[PDB]
Amino acid sequence: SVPSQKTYQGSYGFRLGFLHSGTAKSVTCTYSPALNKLFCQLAKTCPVQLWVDSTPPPGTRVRAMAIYKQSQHMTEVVRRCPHHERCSDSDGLAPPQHLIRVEGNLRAEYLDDRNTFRHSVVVPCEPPEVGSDCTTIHYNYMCYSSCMGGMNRRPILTIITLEDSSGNLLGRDSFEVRVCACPGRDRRTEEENLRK
Ligand SMILES: CN(C)Cc1ccc2c(c1)c1ccccc1n2CC(F)(F)F
Ligand SMILES: [Zn+2]
After folding, report:
1. CA nearest to 74, candidates 155, 177, 178
2. Which of 65, 35, 41, 70 shows the shortest CA–CA distance to 176?
3. Which residues contact 130 (CB under 8 A, 6 or more apart)?
């Protein structure tokens, strides 16, 4: 009733990477290593790098799923709020209830789990372009952390799983997410709180 969040590099040495975008007022997505937390604006591009030490088999896929971080909410499905699920902002592929979308990948598949009712989005795992050492997926988060009737100020984690063609686990990584109006200021504030 609760997906695992344990970091697991697996046989291929799977792990995530993030750009260094800074904390300027104007930044739209920024990652804090000290907090293991991504701060982003609503529906803006969030680049997430995928790194491996060795090449996984054809048919490997990469899935993203959100869960609530606090244990007393972790059995509740993370979904879009009653306003955003009805705002008709579909991209033609993502169900309107799903918080996490993949941008610019026509092979993305969206799952409503028939047993847990949790949402996820999965894409085929492709090698880097020539000249690149990693692959990048572009995610969008489609509600604010503050949305009433949805996340309602509760922190979430995103769990990224590397899976075989049957859906079996090959690797796992995760990060906290805050979707907010001013990610640069919020990252600075939370990093200073941590240091204090
Ligand atoms: C092995 N390093 C140095 C390069 C590298 C980095 C990421 C790579 C690959 C290769 C690669 C090859 C085939 C299929 C998917 C691949 N990916 C994405 C994945 F990390 F697995 F999510
Ligand atoms: Zn919302």
Report:
1. 155
2. 35
3. none
Ligand 1: residue whose CA is nearest its atom 4 = 133
Nearest CA to ligand 1 atom 10: 127
Q: Which domains does the chain have, with CATH numbers?
A: 1-196 (2.60.40.720)
Output the residue whose Cα is nearest ligand 1's atom 19.
Answer: 50
Our answer on whether the CB atom of 171 is closer than 6 Å to any ligand 1 atom is: no
Residue 156 bridge partners (DSSP): 68, 177
- Closest ligand 1 atom number to CA of residue 62: 22
Structural resolution in Å: 1.5
Mutate to test the pocket of ligand 1, among 11, 123, 125 (most ligand atoms within 8 A of CB): 125
State whether the beta carbon of 59 lies less than 6 angstroms from ligand 1: no
Tokens 């970091």: give the residue: 7
Burial class (CB in 10 A: 0-12, 13-18, 19+), 145: buried
CB 23 within 8 A of CB 184: yes
Collapsing DSSP to helix, strand or coil, 193 comes out as helix
Task: Categorise residue 76: left if φ over 0, alpha if ψ from -120 to 50, beta otherwise.
Answer: beta
